Amino acid sequence: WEVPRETLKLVERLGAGQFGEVWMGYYNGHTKVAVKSLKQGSMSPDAFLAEANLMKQLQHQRLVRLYAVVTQEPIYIITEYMENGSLVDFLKTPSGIKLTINKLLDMAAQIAEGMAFIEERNYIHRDLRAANILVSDTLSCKIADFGLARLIEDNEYTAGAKFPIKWTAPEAINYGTFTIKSDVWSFGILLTEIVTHGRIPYPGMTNPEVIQNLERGYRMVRPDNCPEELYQLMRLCWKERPEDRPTFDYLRSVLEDFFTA
Ligand SMILES: COc1nc(Nc2ccc(N3CCNCC3)cc2)ncc1C(=O)Nc1cc(C(=O)Nc2cccc(C(F)(F)F)c2F)ccc1C
């Protein structure tokens, strides 16, 4: 997995943040890659490499696959470059805009397939949303960046760190209890993003507004142009009781059929 740092040529910053940056570059000149570098101090070089180790163990068709690493400060995590960036951005570009519900549902099914495997392996995402879904040149999707429990859950630190309100389940917002079921709720919201081609969820509301209404049992209205059948699948994702929400396997199962229809 190790590669001399010389085989990498950074070219364009893609993302920056608390723990480092993500750059687009080349490996041995010909291979286009995405490189994540750890910001010295931001976090243990060990906890940083944890993400890589998880990646090796969690390889799958619909998940971001590790390519290589550089284990000397500054540590790098390298993956292959996904040409169309993040799903949420892709859906607003001319190509993404013209996509028919069929192609959209297929993509939704791919994500559901990725989540089924994650559920299968006893893991949780914690920050499932279109911004963390990557799209390749042939429009196949892959799930990326699990949300760090350190910054999203209840503990010493967050005690005052927070999360993406509009995508988070009621139980997680209130009691900080994140399970695969809250990832399911989240999937429901991700579903609306896809069908609306990137529109922000709960149009017309602020985060504190969302929170208030959620208590009264409020749920997003079916988007114009969203099949009513698909809509009721979303409603299953937003059931009040977590244990009442469907599994990704079923979701994956049901999405694949709307698509062959
Ligand atoms: C921005 O990161 C990328 N961006 C593109 N393309 C792109 C992005 C934007 C744009 N833009 C921005 C400019 N405007 C035009 C469009 C144009 C191309 N391509 C690849 C990456 C990419 O792999 N990133 C990446 C992701 C992870 C990661 O997920 N870790 C992880 C963590 C936990 C669990 C798993 C699991 F379970 F899933 F295994 C994981 F995998 C780790 C390292 C890296 C480098």
mmCIF file of all heavy atoms in Angstrom, residues 147-196, unseen atoms left out:
data_model
loop_
_atom_site.group_PDB
_atom_site.id
_atom_site.type_symbol
_atom_site.label_atom_id
_atom_site.label_comp_id
_atom_site.label_asym_id
_atom_site.label_seq_id
_atom_site.Cartn_x
_atom_site.Cartn_y
_atom_site.Cartn_z
ATOM 1 N N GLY A 147 -18.993 9.778 8.976
ATOM 2 C CA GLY A 147 -18.880 10.882 9.907
ATOM 3 C C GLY A 147 -18.189 10.456 11.190
ATOM 4 O O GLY A 147 -18.529 9.434 11.759
ATOM 5 N N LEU A 148 -17.196 11.224 11.633
ATOM 6 C CA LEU A 148 -16.461 10.881 12.858
ATOM 7 C C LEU A 148 -17.326 10.946 14.117
ATOM 8 O O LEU A 148 -17.917 11.982 14.421
ATOM 9 C CB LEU A 148 -15.251 11.804 13.034
ATOM 10 C CG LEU A 148 -14.026 11.543 12.130
ATOM 11 C CD1 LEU A 148 -12.954 12.608 12.395
ATOM 12 C CD2 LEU A 148 -13.466 10.134 12.388
ATOM 13 N N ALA A 149 -17.393 9.840 14.852
ATOM 14 C CA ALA A 149 -18.170 9.806 16.080
ATOM 15 C C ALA A 149 -17.677 10.874 17.033
ATOM 16 O O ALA A 149 -18.452 11.451 17.780
ATOM 17 C CB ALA A 149 -18.062 8.427 16.725
ATOM 18 N N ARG A 150 -16.370 11.122 16.977
ATOM 19 C CA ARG A 150 -15.713 12.113 17.829
ATOM 20 C C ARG A 150 -16.354 13.494 17.740
ATOM 21 O O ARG A 150 -16.510 14.179 18.737
ATOM 22 C CB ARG A 150 -14.213 12.223 17.473
ATOM 23 N N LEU A 151 -16.742 13.895 16.537
ATOM 24 C CA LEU A 151 -17.333 15.214 16.360
ATOM 25 C C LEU A 151 -18.856 15.253 16.197
ATOM 26 O O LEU A 151 -19.460 16.310 16.248
ATOM 27 C CB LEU A 151 -16.665 15.898 15.161
ATOM 28 C CG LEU A 151 -15.135 15.933 15.207
ATOM 29 C CD1 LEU A 151 -14.592 14.609 14.683
ATOM 30 C CD2 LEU A 151 -14.620 17.077 14.349
ATOM 31 N N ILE A 152 -19.476 14.098 16.016
ATOM 32 C CA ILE A 152 -20.915 14.072 15.809
ATOM 33 C C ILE A 152 -21.750 13.531 16.981
ATOM 34 O O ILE A 152 -22.883 13.903 17.158
ATOM 35 C CB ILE A 152 -21.245 13.271 14.523
ATOM 36 C CG1 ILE A 152 -20.548 13.917 13.321
ATOM 37 C CG2 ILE A 152 -22.758 13.211 14.305
ATOM 38 C CD1 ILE A 152 -20.821 13.236 11.999
ATOM 39 N N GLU A 153 -21.172 12.647 17.778
ATOM 40 C CA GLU A 153 -21.902 12.076 18.895
ATOM 41 C C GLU A 153 -21.715 12.800 20.217
ATOM 42 O O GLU A 153 -21.049 13.819 20.294
ATOM 43 C CB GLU A 153 -21.531 10.605 19.059
ATOM 44 C CG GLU A 153 -22.259 9.688 18.086
ATOM 45 C CD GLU A 153 -21.677 8.299 18.074
ATOM 46 O OE1 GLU A 153 -20.779 8.038 18.913
ATOM 47 O OE2 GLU A 153 -22.100 7.470 17.230
ATOM 48 N N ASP A 154 -22.331 12.254 21.257
ATOM 49 C CA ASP A 154 -22.246 12.831 22.588
ATOM 50 C C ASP A 154 -21.026 12.315 23.320
ATOM 51 O O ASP A 154 -20.823 11.115 23.431
ATOM 52 C CB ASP A 154 -23.502 12.497 23.387
ATOM 53 C CG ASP A 154 -24.609 13.471 23.128
ATOM 54 O OD1 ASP A 154 -24.511 14.215 22.127
ATOM 55 O OD2 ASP A 154 -25.577 13.509 23.916
ATOM 56 N N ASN A 155 -20.217 13.237 23.822
ATOM 57 C CA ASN A 155 -19.020 12.864 24.552
ATOM 58 C C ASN A 155 -18.326 14.116 25.060
ATOM 59 O O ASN A 155 -18.939 15.176 25.163
ATOM 60 C CB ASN A 155 -18.072 12.091 23.629
ATOM 61 C CG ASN A 155 -17.750 12.854 22.350
ATOM 62 O OD1 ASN A 155 -17.439 14.047 22.387
ATOM 63 N ND2 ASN A 155 -17.821 12.168 21.211
ATOM 64 N N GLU A 156 -17.055 13.965 25.428
ATOM 65 C CA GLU A 156 -16.254 15.114 25.835
ATOM 66 C C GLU A 156 -15.671 15.530 24.490
ATOM 67 O O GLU A 156 -15.019 14.743 23.807
ATOM 68 C CB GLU A 156 -15.131 14.722 26.799
ATOM 69 C CG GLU A 156 -14.197 13.675 26.229
ATOM 70 C CD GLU A 156 -13.165 13.202 27.240
ATOM 71 O OE1 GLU A 156 -12.141 13.901 27.435
ATOM 72 O OE2 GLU A 156 -13.389 12.134 27.866
ATOM 73 N N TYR A 157 -15.951 16.768 24.123
ATOM 74 C CA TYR A 157 -15.545 17.391 22.874
ATOM 75 C C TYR A 157 -16.852 18.042 22.472
ATOM 76 O O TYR A 157 -17.095 19.185 22.811
ATOM 77 C CB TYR A 157 -15.106 16.355 21.826
ATOM 78 N N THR A 158 -17.711 17.299 21.785
ATOM 79 C CA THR A 158 -18.991 17.851 21.367
ATOM 80 C C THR A 158 -19.664 18.568 22.554
ATOM 81 O O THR A 158 -20.443 19.518 22.375
ATOM 82 C CB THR A 158 -19.891 16.741 20.848
ATOM 83 O OG1 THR A 158 -20.049 15.729 21.859
ATOM 84 C CG2 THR A 158 -19.250 16.106 19.609
ATOM 85 N N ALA A 159 -19.354 18.120 23.771
ATOM 86 C CA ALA A 159 -19.920 18.711 24.988
ATOM 87 C C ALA A 159 -19.541 20.190 25.138
ATOM 88 O O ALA A 159 -18.386 20.535 25.407
ATOM 89 C CB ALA A 159 -19.460 17.912 26.219
ATOM 90 N N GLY A 160 -18.926 22.835 21.424
ATOM 91 C CA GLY A 160 -20.162 22.097 21.558
ATOM 92 C C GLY A 160 -20.533 21.589 20.188
ATOM 93 O O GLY A 160 -21.526 21.992 19.613
ATOM 94 N N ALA A 161 -19.732 20.669 19.677
ATOM 95 C CA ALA A 161 -19.914 20.132 18.334
ATOM 96 C C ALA A 161 -21.276 19.602 17.894
ATOM 97 O O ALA A 161 -21.976 18.936 18.657
ATOM 98 C CB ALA A 161 -18.840 19.082 18.082
ATOM 99 N N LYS A 162 -21.632 19.892 16.636
ATOM 100 C CA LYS A 162 -22.907 19.456 16.046
ATOM 101 C C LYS A 162 -22.824 18.770 14.660
ATOM 102 O O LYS A 162 -21.731 18.499 14.115
ATOM 103 C CB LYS A 162 -23.901 20.641 15.967
ATOM 104 N N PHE A 163 -24.014 18.513 14.104
ATOM 105 C CA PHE A 163 -24.211 17.779 12.834
ATOM 106 C C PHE A 163 -25.180 18.437 11.839
ATOM 107 O O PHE A 163 -25.751 19.491 12.112
ATOM 108 C CB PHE A 163 -24.713 16.350 13.198
ATOM 109 C CG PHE A 163 -25.683 16.344 14.364
ATOM 110 C CD1 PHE A 163 -26.993 16.816 14.210
ATOM 111 C CD2 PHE A 163 -25.244 15.997 15.642
ATOM 112 C CE1 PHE A 163 -27.849 16.948 15.321
ATOM 113 C CE2 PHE A 163 -26.078 16.120 16.759
ATOM 114 C CZ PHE A 163 -27.388 16.600 16.601
ATOM 115 N N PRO A 164 -25.363 17.804 10.659
ATOM 116 C CA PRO A 164 -26.254 18.284 9.586
ATOM 117 C C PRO A 164 -27.730 18.094 9.893
ATOM 118 O O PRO A 164 -28.360 17.146 9.427
ATOM 119 C CB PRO A 164 -25.832 17.445 8.368
ATOM 120 C CG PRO A 164 -24.410 17.070 8.692
ATOM 121 C CD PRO A 164 -24.529 16.708 10.140
ATOM 122 N N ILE A 165 -28.276 19.022 10.661
ATOM 123 C CA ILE A 165 -29.665 18.949 11.074
ATOM 124 C C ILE A 165 -30.681 18.360 10.107
ATOM 125 O O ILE A 165 -31.273 17.338 10.406
ATOM 126 C CB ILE A 165 -30.149 20.310 11.535
ATOM 127 C CG1 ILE A 165 -29.445 20.647 12.838
ATOM 128 C CG2 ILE A 165 -31.667 20.305 11.749
ATOM 129 C CD1 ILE A 165 -29.741 19.651 13.936
ATOM 130 N N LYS A 166 -30.870 18.983 8.949
ATOM 131 C CA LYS A 166 -31.861 18.502 7.988
ATOM 132 C C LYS A 166 -31.772 17.052 7.526
ATOM 133 O O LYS A 166 -32.693 16.571 6.907
ATOM 134 C CB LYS A 166 -31.901 19.420 6.760
ATOM 135 C CG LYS A 166 -32.362 20.835 7.078
ATOM 136 C CD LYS A 166 -32.715 21.618 5.824
ATOM 137 C CE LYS A 166 -33.226 23.016 6.157
ATOM 138 N NZ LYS A 166 -33.608 23.759 4.921
ATOM 139 N N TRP A 167 -30.669 16.368 7.817
ATOM 140 C CA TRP A 167 -30.515 14.968 7.413
ATOM 141 C C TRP A 167 -30.556 14.026 8.605
ATOM 142 O O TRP A 167 -30.751 12.846 8.450
ATOM 143 C CB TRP A 167 -29.181 14.745 6.683
ATOM 144 C CG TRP A 167 -29.159 15.161 5.253
ATOM 145 C CD1 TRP A 167 -29.351 14.362 4.153
ATOM 146 C CD2 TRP A 167 -28.901 16.471 4.755
ATOM 147 N NE1 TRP A 167 -29.224 15.104 2.999
ATOM 148 C CE2 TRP A 167 -28.949 16.402 3.342
ATOM 149 C CE3 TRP A 167 -28.633 17.701 5.365
ATOM 150 C CZ2 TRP A 167 -28.735 17.518 2.533
ATOM 151 C CZ3 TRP A 167 -28.422 18.810 4.562
ATOM 152 C CH2 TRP A 167 -28.475 18.712 3.160
ATOM 153 N N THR A 168 -30.374 14.575 9.797
ATOM 154 C CA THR A 168 -30.336 13.760 11.000
ATOM 155 C C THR A 168 -31.690 13.361 11.600
ATOM 156 O O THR A 168 -32.621 14.170 11.689
ATOM 157 C CB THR A 168 -29.474 14.462 12.070
ATOM 158 O OG1 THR A 168 -28.216 14.838 11.487
ATOM 159 C CG2 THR A 168 -29.213 13.530 13.254
ATOM 160 N N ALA A 169 -31.777 12.096 12.010
ATOM 161 C CA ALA A 169 -32.988 11.547 12.616
ATOM 162 C C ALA A 169 -33.310 12.228 13.950
ATOM 163 O O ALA A 169 -32.417 12.744 14.642
ATOM 164 C CB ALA A 169 -32.831 10.035 12.830
ATOM 165 N N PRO A 170 -34.599 12.235 14.328
ATOM 166 C CA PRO A 170 -35.070 12.846 15.575
ATOM 167 C C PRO A 170 -34.364 12.316 16.820
ATOM 168 O O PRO A 170 -34.005 13.080 17.695
ATOM 169 C CB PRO A 170 -36.561 12.510 15.581
ATOM 170 C CG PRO A 170 -36.900 12.429 14.132
ATOM 171 C CD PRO A 170 -35.729 11.681 13.562
ATOM 172 N N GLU A 171 -34.180 11.003 16.891
ATOM 173 C CA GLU A 171 -33.533 10.399 18.047
ATOM 174 C C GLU A 171 -32.071 10.837 18.171
ATOM 175 O O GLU A 171 -31.573 11.020 19.264
ATOM 176 C CB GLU A 171 -33.616 8.864 17.977
ATOM 177 C CG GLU A 171 -32.796 8.228 16.846
ATOM 178 C CD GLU A 171 -33.582 8.043 15.561
ATOM 179 O OE1 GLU A 171 -34.584 8.765 15.366
ATOM 180 O OE2 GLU A 171 -33.185 7.181 14.739
ATOM 181 N N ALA A 172 -31.398 11.005 17.037
ATOM 182 C CA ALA A 172 -29.999 11.419 17.030
ATOM 183 C C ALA A 172 -29.875 12.885 17.428
ATOM 184 O O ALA A 172 -28.939 13.278 18.123
ATOM 185 C CB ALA A 172 -29.398 11.207 15.651
ATOM 186 N N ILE A 173 -30.815 13.702 16.971
ATOM 187 C CA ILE A 173 -30.785 15.116 17.319
ATOM 188 C C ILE A 173 -31.007 15.276 18.823
ATOM 189 O O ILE A 173 -30.245 15.956 19.502
ATOM 190 C CB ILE A 173 -31.881 15.910 16.566
ATOM 191 C CG1 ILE A 173 -31.450 16.148 15.115
ATOM 192 C CG2 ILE A 173 -32.161 17.216 17.289
ATOM 193 C CD1 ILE A 173 -32.462 16.926 14.269
ATOM 194 N N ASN A 174 -32.059 14.638 19.332
ATOM 195 C CA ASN A 174 -32.409 14.711 20.745
ATOM 196 C C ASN A 174 -31.429 14.019 21.692
ATOM 197 O O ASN A 174 -30.815 14.661 22.548
ATOM 198 C CB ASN A 174 -33.805 14.110 20.970
ATOM 199 C CG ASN A 174 -34.910 14.934 20.327
ATOM 200 O OD1 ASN A 174 -36.018 14.438 20.101
ATOM 201 N ND2 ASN A 174 -34.615 16.200 20.033
ATOM 202 N N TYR A 175 -31.276 12.711 21.527
ATOM 203 C CA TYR A 175 -30.430 11.938 22.424
ATOM 204 C C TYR A 175 -29.086 11.491 21.886
ATOM 205 O O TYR A 175 -28.422 10.688 22.508
ATOM 206 C CB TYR A 175 -31.216 10.722 22.899
ATOM 207 C CG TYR A 175 -32.668 11.043 23.172
ATOM 208 C CD1 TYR A 175 -33.681 10.449 22.427
ATOM 209 C CD2 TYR A 175 -33.029 11.948 24.170
ATOM 210 C CE1 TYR A 175 -35.026 10.749 22.672
ATOM 211 C CE2 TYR A 175 -34.369 12.254 24.422
ATOM 212 C CZ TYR A 175 -35.357 11.650 23.670
ATOM 213 O OH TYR A 175 -36.679 11.933 23.920
ATOM 214 N N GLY A 176 -28.690 12.008 20.730
ATOM 215 C CA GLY A 176 -27.407 11.625 20.169
ATOM 216 C C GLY A 176 -27.241 10.130 19.965
ATOM 217 O O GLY A 176 -26.133 9.597 20.080
ATOM 218 N N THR A 177 -28.335 9.439 19.666
ATOM 219 C CA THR A 177 -28.237 8.010 19.436
ATOM 220 C C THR A 177 -28.220 7.716 17.932
ATOM 221 O O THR A 177 -29.231 7.783 17.265
ATOM 222 C CB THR A 177 -29.395 7.241 20.159
ATOM 223 O OG1 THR A 177 -30.098 6.412 19.226
ATOM 224 C CG2 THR A 177 -30.365 8.216 20.812
ATOM 225 N N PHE A 178 -27.037 7.421 17.403
ATOM 226 C CA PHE A 178 -26.894 7.114 15.987
ATOM 227 C C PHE A 178 -26.745 5.619 15.772
ATOM 228 O O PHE A 178 -25.883 4.979 16.360
ATOM 229 C CB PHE A 178 -25.681 7.832 15.389
ATOM 230 C CG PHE A 178 -25.751 9.322 15.494
ATOM 231 C CD1 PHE A 178 -25.565 9.953 16.721
ATOM 232 C CD2 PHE A 178 -26.047 10.095 14.374
ATOM 233 C CE1 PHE A 178 -25.675 11.339 16.837
ATOM 234 C CE2 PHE A 178 -26.161 11.479 14.473
ATOM 235 C CZ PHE A 178 -25.976 12.107 15.708
ATOM 236 N N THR A 179 -27.605 5.069 14.931
ATOM 237 C CA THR A 179 -27.556 3.656 14.624
ATOM 238 C C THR A 179 -27.734 3.566 13.125
ATOM 239 O O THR A 179 -27.776 4.600 12.423
ATOM 240 C CB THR A 179 -28.709 2.869 15.286
ATOM 241 O OG1 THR A 179 -29.950 3.229 14.666
ATOM 242 C CG2 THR A 179 -28.776 3.158 16.780
ATOM 243 N N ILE A 180 -27.837 2.343 12.625
ATOM 244 C CA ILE A 180 -28.038 2.154 11.206
ATOM 245 C C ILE A 180 -29.413 2.722 10.845
ATOM 246 O O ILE A 180 -29.625 3.170 9.736
ATOM 247 C CB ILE A 180 -27.971 0.664 10.826
ATOM 248 C CG1 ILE A 180 -28.094 0.521 9.309
ATOM 249 C CG2 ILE A 180 -29.053 -0.123 11.562
ATOM 250 C CD1 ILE A 180 -26.909 1.107 8.549
ATOM 251 N N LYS A 181 -30.338 2.709 11.802
ATOM 252 C CA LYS A 181 -31.680 3.238 11.568
ATOM 253 C C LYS A 181 -31.675 4.728 11.296
ATOM 254 O O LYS A 181 -32.481 5.203 10.511
ATOM 255 C CB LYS A 181 -32.604 2.935 12.754
ATOM 256 C CG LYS A 181 -32.923 1.459 12.889
ATOM 257 C CD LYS A 181 -33.417 0.896 11.566
ATOM 258 C CE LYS A 181 -33.670 -0.589 11.650
ATOM 259 N NZ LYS A 181 -34.158 -1.115 10.339
ATOM 260 N N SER A 182 -30.782 5.471 11.954
ATOM 261 C CA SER A 182 -30.713 6.905 11.693
ATOM 262 C C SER A 182 -30.027 7.095 10.332
ATOM 263 O O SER A 182 -30.237 8.097 9.670
ATOM 264 C CB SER A 182 -29.980 7.669 12.819
ATOM 265 O OG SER A 182 -28.626 7.305 12.958
ATOM 266 N N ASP A 183 -29.216 6.129 9.899
ATOM 267 C CA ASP A 183 -28.623 6.284 8.569
ATOM 268 C C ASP A 183 -29.775 6.112 7.557
ATOM 269 O O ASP A 183 -29.797 6.753 6.519
ATOM 270 C CB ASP A 183 -27.523 5.244 8.282
ATOM 271 C CG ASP A 183 -26.206 5.533 9.021
ATOM 272 O OD1 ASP A 183 -25.836 6.712 9.227
ATOM 273 O OD2 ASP A 183 -25.523 4.552 9.376
ATOM 274 N N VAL A 184 -30.731 5.242 7.885
ATOM 275 C CA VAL A 184 -31.883 5.000 7.024
ATOM 276 C C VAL A 184 -32.709 6.281 6.851
ATOM 277 O O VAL A 184 -33.064 6.642 5.751
ATOM 278 C CB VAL A 184 -32.803 3.879 7.607
ATOM 279 C CG1 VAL A 184 -34.119 3.808 6.838
ATOM 280 C CG2 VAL A 184 -32.092 2.534 7.544
ATOM 281 N N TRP A 185 -33.016 6.948 7.959
ATOM 282 C CA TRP A 185 -33.789 8.181 7.901
ATOM 283 C C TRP A 185 -33.073 9.095 6.922
ATOM 284 O O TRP A 185 -33.653 9.611 5.980
ATOM 285 C CB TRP A 185 -33.845 8.836 9.285
ATOM 286 C CG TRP A 185 -34.438 10.228 9.292
ATOM 287 C CD1 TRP A 185 -33.908 11.351 8.716
ATOM 288 C CD2 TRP A 185 -35.681 10.631 9.886
ATOM 289 N NE1 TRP A 185 -34.744 12.425 8.909
ATOM 290 C CE2 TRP A 185 -35.840 12.014 9.622
ATOM 291 C CE3 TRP A 185 -36.679 9.958 10.612
ATOM 292 C CZ2 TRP A 185 -36.961 12.739 10.060
ATOM 293 C CZ3 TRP A 185 -37.800 10.684 11.049
ATOM 294 C CH2 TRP A 185 -37.926 12.059 10.767
ATOM 295 N N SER A 186 -31.787 9.270 7.180
ATOM 296 C CA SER A 186 -30.925 10.088 6.360
ATOM 297 C C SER A 186 -31.056 9.733 4.879
ATOM 298 O O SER A 186 -31.105 10.622 4.022
ATOM 299 C CB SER A 186 -29.482 9.905 6.824
ATOM 300 O OG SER A 186 -28.593 10.470 5.890
ATOM 301 N N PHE A 187 -31.121 8.438 4.584
ATOM 302 C CA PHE A 187 -31.248 7.997 3.203
ATOM 303 C C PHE A 187 -32.528 8.558 2.597
ATOM 304 O O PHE A 187 -32.553 8.920 1.432
ATOM 305 C CB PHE A 187 -31.261 6.469 3.115
ATOM 306 C CG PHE A 187 -31.269 5.944 1.704
ATOM 307 C CD1 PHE A 187 -30.133 6.046 0.896
ATOM 308 C CD2 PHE A 187 -32.408 5.352 1.178
ATOM 309 C CE1 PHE A 187 -30.136 5.562 -0.421
ATOM 310 C CE2 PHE A 187 -32.425 4.867 -0.130
ATOM 311 C CZ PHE A 187 -31.282 4.971 -0.935
ATOM 312 N N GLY A 188 -33.585 8.627 3.405
ATOM 313 C CA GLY A 188 -34.846 9.160 2.923
ATOM 314 C C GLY A 188 -34.661 10.584 2.433
ATOM 315 O O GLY A 188 -35.159 10.958 1.378
ATOM 316 N N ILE A 189 -33.931 11.375 3.215
ATOM 317 C CA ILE A 189 -33.648 12.765 2.871
ATOM 318 C C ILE A 189 -32.747 12.818 1.631
ATOM 319 O O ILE A 189 -32.917 13.667 0.774
ATOM 320 C CB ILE A 189 -32.944 13.500 4.035
ATOM 321 C CG1 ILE A 189 -33.809 13.431 5.302
ATOM 322 C CG2 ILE A 189 -32.660 14.939 3.650
ATOM 323 C CD1 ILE A 189 -35.170 14.106 5.194
ATOM 324 N N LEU A 190 -31.786 11.901 1.549
ATOM 325 C CA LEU A 190 -30.890 11.869 0.400
ATOM 326 C C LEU A 190 -31.733 11.576 -0.829
ATOM 327 O O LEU A 190 -31.426 12.035 -1.942
ATOM 328 C CB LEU A 190 -29.819 10.783 0.567
ATOM 329 C CG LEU A 190 -28.747 10.639 -0.524
ATOM 330 C CD1 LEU A 190 -27.563 9.840 0.006
ATOM 331 C CD2 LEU A 190 -29.324 9.951 -1.733
ATOM 332 N N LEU A 191 -32.803 10.809 -0.623
ATOM 333 C CA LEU A 191 -33.698 10.451 -1.710
ATOM 334 C C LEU A 191 -34.315 11.702 -2.332
ATOM 335 O O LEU A 191 -34.396 11.807 -3.545
ATOM 336 C CB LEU A 191 -34.795 9.525 -1.196
ATOM 337 C CG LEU A 191 -34.988 8.140 -1.830
ATOM 338 C CD1 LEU A 191 -33.695 7.631 -2.450
ATOM 339 C CD2 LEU A 191 -35.484 7.185 -0.755
ATOM 340 N N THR A 192 -34.728 12.654 -1.498
ATOM 341 C CA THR A 192 -35.335 13.882 -2.003
ATOM 342 C C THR A 192 -34.338 14.726 -2.784
ATOM 343 O O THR A 192 -34.694 15.350 -3.772
ATOM 344 C CB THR A 192 -35.938 14.742 -0.867
ATOM 345 O OG1 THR A 192 -34.903 15.151 0.030
ATOM 346 C CG2 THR A 192 -36.999 13.958 -0.109
ATOM 347 N N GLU A 193 -33.091 14.738 -2.329
ATOM 348 C CA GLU A 193 -32.046 15.488 -3.006
ATOM 349 C C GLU A 193 -31.894 14.999 -4.445
ATOM 350 O O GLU A 193 -31.781 15.793 -5.384
ATOM 351 C CB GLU A 193 -30.715 15.306 -2.288
ATOM 352 C CG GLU A 193 -30.517 16.106 -1.025
ATOM 353 C CD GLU A 193 -29.120 15.879 -0.445
ATOM 354 O OE1 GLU A 193 -28.844 14.766 0.071
ATOM 355 O OE2 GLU A 193 -28.285 16.808 -0.518
ATOM 356 N N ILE A 194 -31.884 13.682 -4.611
ATOM 357 C CA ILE A 194 -31.730 13.081 -5.927
ATOM 358 C C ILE A 194 -32.866 13.424 -6.877
ATOM 359 O O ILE A 194 -32.629 13.889 -7.981
ATOM 360 C CB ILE A 194 -31.638 11.538 -5.841
ATOM 361 C CG1 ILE A 194 -30.330 11.125 -5.177
ATOM 362 C CG2 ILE A 194 -31.752 10.918 -7.230
ATOM 363 C CD1 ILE A 194 -30.137 9.630 -5.129
ATOM 364 N N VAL A 195 -34.099 13.177 -6.436
ATOM 365 C CA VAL A 195 -35.268 13.430 -7.265
ATOM 366 C C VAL A 195 -35.451 14.909 -7.631
ATOM 367 O O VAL A 195 -35.971 15.230 -8.690
ATOM 368 C CB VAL A 195 -36.550 12.881 -6.587
ATOM 369 C CG1 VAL A 195 -36.947 13.746 -5.422
ATOM 370 C CG2 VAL A 195 -37.669 12.805 -7.593
ATOM 371 N N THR A 196 -35.011 15.808 -6.757
ATOM 372 C CA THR A 196 -35.127 17.244 -7.023
ATOM 373 C C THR A 196 -33.876 17.786 -7.702
ATOM 374 O O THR A 196 -33.732 18.980 -7.883
ATOM 375 C CB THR A 196 -35.322 18.051 -5.739
ATOM 376 O OG1 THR A 196 -34.188 17.859 -4.878
ATOM 377 C CG2 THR A 196 -36.598 17.627 -5.037
#
